[PDB]
Amino acid sequence: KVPGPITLIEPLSGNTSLLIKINAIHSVKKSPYQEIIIADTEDYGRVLILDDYIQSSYVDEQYYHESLVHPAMATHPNPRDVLILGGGEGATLREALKHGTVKRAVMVDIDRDVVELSRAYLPQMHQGAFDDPRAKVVIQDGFVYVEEAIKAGDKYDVIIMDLTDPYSSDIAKQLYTREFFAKIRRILNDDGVVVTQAGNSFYFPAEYDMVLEGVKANFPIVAEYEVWIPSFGYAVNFILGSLRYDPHALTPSEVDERLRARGVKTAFYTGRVHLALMNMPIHRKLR
Amino acid sequence: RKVPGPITLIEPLSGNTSLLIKINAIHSVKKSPYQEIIIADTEDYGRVLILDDYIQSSYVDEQYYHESLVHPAMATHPNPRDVLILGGGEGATLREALKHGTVKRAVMVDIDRDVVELSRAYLPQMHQGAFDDPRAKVVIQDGFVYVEEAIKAGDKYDVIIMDLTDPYSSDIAKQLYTREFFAKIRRILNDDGVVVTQAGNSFYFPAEYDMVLEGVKANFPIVAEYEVWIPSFGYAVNFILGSLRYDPHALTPSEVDERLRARGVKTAFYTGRVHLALMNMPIHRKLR
Amino acid sequence: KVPGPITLIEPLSGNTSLLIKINAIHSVKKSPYQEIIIADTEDYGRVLILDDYIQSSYVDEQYYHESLVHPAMATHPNPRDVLILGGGEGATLREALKHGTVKRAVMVDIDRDVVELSRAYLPQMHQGAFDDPRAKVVIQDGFVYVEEAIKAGDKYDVIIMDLTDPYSSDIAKQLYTREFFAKIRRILNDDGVVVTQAGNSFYFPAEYDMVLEGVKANFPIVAEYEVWIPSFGYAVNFILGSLRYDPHALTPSEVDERLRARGVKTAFYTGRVHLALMNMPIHRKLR
Amino acid sequence: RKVPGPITLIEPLSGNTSLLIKINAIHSVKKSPYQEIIIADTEDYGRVLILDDYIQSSYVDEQYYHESLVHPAMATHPNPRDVLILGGGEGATLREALKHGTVKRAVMVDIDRDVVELSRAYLPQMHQGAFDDPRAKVVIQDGFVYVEEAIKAGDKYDVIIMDLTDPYSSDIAKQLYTREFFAKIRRILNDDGVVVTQAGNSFYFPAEYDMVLEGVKANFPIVAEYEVWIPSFGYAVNFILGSLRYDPHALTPSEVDERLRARGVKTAFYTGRVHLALMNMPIHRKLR
């Protein structure tokens, strides 16, 4: 068996791509910002594709979304106010809302078409999160939202950046700079945490290192971790910046008690997974 | 950039996903009696060994594979002196095992002389002279027969490392992945012995993975499951370690690092902290 | 620009395939006989795909259907009764019905799902041909239809075989044999003509030559010709067997007068195209 | 079988269609100052020259290309003595033109020394010694400059054959496809001279094709358009022949065959009947 007859050619590095059997195409939209496809794949189930890159799949998105959200949320001892930049399919919001401490969660995506198509075609991703009375969905460039938040003196406990990739995405490029992370720091409480996905350190080390150095220039505690996402073809790199709380100091017991006390149910993330993420070095080309 | 090329390897993975990998050069192509062998240069991963279309090892990421296959088992054993490797044709598994200063005798058994000979010639960064270490012996034989002979002879090893072609694709390795074969492996281990094998991938090939796992569990009281992403393969390779006496979960990072230091083992990846992460990270499965 | 992100991998020889950008998928059906896809391609417009092979495209099917049908129909001085084996999209029937001499045209396809999906999704192919009062559409294995025609003493003037390929198709394999062409001869009038597509002589010479020798064992006049069909990746080979009339003896004038007298309008086929088809050797591997 | 491989050339064609072609070997890879050159072996087509990812010629089907490019123009000319070839780096265009016993002087001008040198070394079935025929001269120069120099010098040819990289893809050949360049070609033809060029493909690249056609028509009173399927390219290559005096449509098959015989021309494809078919078959265009 080989992939086809109808296949997605998913870019990866420029020198490697994935060839993925497609069973159906549900939606194609050229938005003002990007090319959107919602399709069914044989190996990964339903997917969101943006500019040819799978952003999430039914079969493995929970690895991505739980790994993006819960280490930072569990590290903060009382996350009440949460900001999400990107996260158009709603799954980042879904995970953050599981924390019973959360009173307000704002999600800011530039592209109304991604959110509306996700609402319509990706119900296993959002799972109603867009309609939670604690949630607000804002259609705006996150750069502009953060500048307005600074003017307003707005502050959050946890900021989650769930954007398109730093190595491919023009629309997200301004949000991966040292200057942006300095703005993020200005809309965090003094014990705040930021987490971002940072592409991949194996295939895109220069872009990874640029995001890492921009977090380190602004946050005194930084954790790097990665999780293999089969549908993407690589282990996504995450970078967690913290003003006060050290994620490396949580024990599997402290994590599992915060999860239980806050009513958080997961498919992947646990205190032992947290320990593994805090101890596994990230991949690099070794020769 | 969207389509690597102009010359590309189409590397199978699941049957419903494959990798397209830019090729810069083709150094050797041999149809052996067992399999189709290619040694080539890739842009992303450097030089590769390809067997029946599957990358076995790449210069850029083989140390992730070989260190993860070898060192957890070798570090868990308090004094591994006698090591057996089944498969490992490029010599990098033997290279890693020989780093342990406790090792007195290492035997590697590959069915395919042509893989070993082309690796000797074209993959020096993989073997790094391991084939010619005076503690090493390279045997060309079906590992199935080698183990049958070892049992007749009463031979015993401390650590047995299975570095074979995949359980989901490889007819030549199929008989080495069974419950019956792991019962034969137990018979050629010392009472405190350890086995480790690669077991394909639990996300894309859970049925094949589970049959290897149930074959190990039937024969060993301690079974550890761990995985490591190997970029050039397109997935996290699953490893299964079976132990008769020593539990790899009981070894702290400081204990691992002290054993590596005492034994003179230098690595690019494996450390005590890596061991702790391998011991705690659940393996991937399709979640929907 | 390169094909994608969603692509058809169209087999060709086993050692060459085509990679074709897909814009939409209209229908997927696994029939009892074969895998059917109706899709839109960027280069070729809408296509019928059977077992991964494009059978016809909006942009180039008229090359195929006119080349299959009109040399044989124009060679016969009075084709009244026409049989088509295969031709599920209706375009072979469409072309044959243009000949004003035709009183009865029967089309026999094994697969109801191909005909019904073509009716629904390929109107530029059938163009109403299935509803012409001179046409009958029969769902049957053509092998069985021809055996029943022999029992009935049924006779035709022109028989057009428009089947799936001799080199790939199990369902059509019995219709490409010497014994089948002997049956065809039995349901032709003594001045009858047969024409079949025969795959490709460059990539599949053995299968081509088998069809050719089966026509030659049964028909004293045989013409070989080929036409490049871009969507397929090759020049389709045709073999015309004739009991009486020599297609090599028509002049561009005799063809253009038969076409005008019979009211036949074409996009490609003319008397000069006939002359070229009768004189161009077919492709073979030269080394 | 559905996906050729494991090692494959991804050959561009239209941007919305490409060919996947199994590769058996890579003999040479050179980045010249002008283009990326690969000489490789394909399963379907044998040895190939590839320039910027496009197959230029294959052992199995190059004679269809070279015979169709050269012989209609050469047979239409009643006595072609002086021949100029622009491009034709593998030497097969020169090989075909030299078959005509009337030819006294043939000059081939390629911009890229590396294409000619690698063809000499690796494509002997294409040049077949043509580079070393005493009637031949190989010049390494931009054909644009060669023709500017020829005009200054008052040089004239009987037949000019343009065998360049494609008008739709090739920056190095772009200036040779213009109306202005065909006016310079007229100035270096004898009064009864003939030009022929390949012109890409009218089905996939009709705009580029039409601009070459209108450039020829502006400068020549007789223009013949014909095409031939070249399997390894994925399309029927379009040719455009411009003539000052002799009409290729007026030559019957018997006249063609007699000229080929008198001149000692042996071919694998081209005959008088082929000429008649080329003269009568309309070129392909998208019909919807």
Ligand SMILES: CSC[C@H]1O[C@@H](n2cnc3c(N)ncnc32)[C@H](O)[C@@H]1O
């Ligand atoms: C699907 S998760 C990634 C999301 O990041 C969003 N995105 C990309 N750039 C920006 C931006 N500058 N501000 C907010 N959202 C963005 C995209 O629209 C997408 O839905």
Ligand SMILES: CSC[C@H]1O[C@@H](n2cnc3c(N)ncnc32)[C@H](O)[C@@H]1O
């Ligand atoms: C490259 S590492 C995998 C190796 O497993 C080897 N192998 C596969 N099957 C067997 C077997 N039955 N016995 C020993 N080696 C084998 C292959 O020849 C290959 O070199």
Ligand SMILES: CSC[C@H]1O[C@@H](n2cnc3c(N)ncnc32)[C@H](O)[C@@H]1O
């Ligand atoms: C699309 S044109 C080719 C057609 O040949 C038809 N076909 C294949 N084998 C047979 C058969 N044995 N009898 C009749 N039609 C056939 C297929 O169903 C298809 O629609």
Ligand SMILES: CSC[C@H]1O[C@@H](n2cnc3c(N)ncnc32)[C@H](O)[C@@H]1O
């Ligand atoms: C292989 S046949 C096509 C040839 O056209 C040649 N070519 C392309 N542009 C020019 C040019 N401007 N002058 C002469 N040769 C050229 C290329 O180097 C190639 O070898």
